[PDB]
Amino acid sequence: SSSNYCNQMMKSRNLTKDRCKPVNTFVHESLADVQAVCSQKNVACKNGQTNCYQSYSTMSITDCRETGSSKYPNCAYKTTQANKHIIVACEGNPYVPVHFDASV
């Protein structure tokens, strides 16, 4: 693993300590603003479920994707920063995000 943001965060957040996860997205917004998405635009999830919601506005996100030569234990990621709408699946009470469906 290099020293770029993705390699470091994937490791510190216990995502690549025991394996190399292909892709992961990190959202750079306050926790409460992300939780607020669960009462925003209702949309169908990729699986057909209807408990997904899309944020009205774009949010700061970092996409982490394994490179072609990445192999455990030396996971390697390409870091891509962008501003896009997030789509999350919400459940429970309080109604909060439990899955990151996608980003637009």
């Binding site: 216990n14 995502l15 997205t25 990190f26 750079h28 995000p97 439990v98 990151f100």
Partner: peptide
């Protein structure tokens, strides 16, 4: 141990 909500935060949130 951790809930689905907690897992989401650990894996995706970086305030």
């Amino acid at each position: 141990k951790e809930t689905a909500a907690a897992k989401f935060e650990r894996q995706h949130v970086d305030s």
